[PDB]
Amino acid sequence: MSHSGAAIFEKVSGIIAINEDVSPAELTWRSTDGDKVHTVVLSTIDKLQATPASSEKMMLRLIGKVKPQRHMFSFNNRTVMDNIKMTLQQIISRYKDADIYEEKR
Partner 1 sequence: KLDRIEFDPKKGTFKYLSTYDVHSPSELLKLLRSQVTFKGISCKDLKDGWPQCDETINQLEEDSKILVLRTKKDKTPRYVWYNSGGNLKCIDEEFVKMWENVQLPQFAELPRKLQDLGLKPASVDPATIKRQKITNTHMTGILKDYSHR
Partner 2 sequence: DRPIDDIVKNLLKFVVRGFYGGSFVLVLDAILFHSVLAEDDLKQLLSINKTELGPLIARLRSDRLISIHKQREYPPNSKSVERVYYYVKYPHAIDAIKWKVHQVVQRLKDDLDKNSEPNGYMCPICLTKYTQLEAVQLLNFDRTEFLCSLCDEPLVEDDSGKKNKEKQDKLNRLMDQIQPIIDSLKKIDDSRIEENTFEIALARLIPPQNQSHAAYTYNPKKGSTMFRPGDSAPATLHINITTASDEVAQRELQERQAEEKRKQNAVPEWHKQSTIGKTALGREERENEKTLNDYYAALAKKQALEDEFEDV
Partner 3 sequence: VNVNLSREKILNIFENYPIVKKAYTDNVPKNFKEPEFWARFFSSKLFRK
Tell me which residues touch partner 3 (CB under 8 A): 23, 90, 94, 97-98, 101-102
CB 10 within 8 A of CB 73: no
For residue 54, count CB atoms less than 10 angstroms from its CB and return exposed for 0-12, middle for 13-18, buried for 19 or more. Answer: exposed
Closer to partner 2 at the Cβ: 53 or 66? 53
x/- track of binding to partner 2 for residues 5-44 (CB under 8 A): -x-x--xxxxx---------------xxx-x---------
Min dist. Cβ of residue 62 to partner 1 (A): 24
Out of 11, 22, 34, 54, which residue is the one contacting partner 1 (CB under 8 A)? 34
Least Cα distance to 9 among 73, 61, 60 occurs for 73
Task: For residue 32, state whether it binds partner 1 (rule: CB under 8 A).
Answer: yes
Min dist. Cβ of residue 19 to partner 3 (A): 14
Farthest-apart Cα atoms in the chain, separation: 46
| Omega within 30 of 0 (cis) for the link into 24 | yes
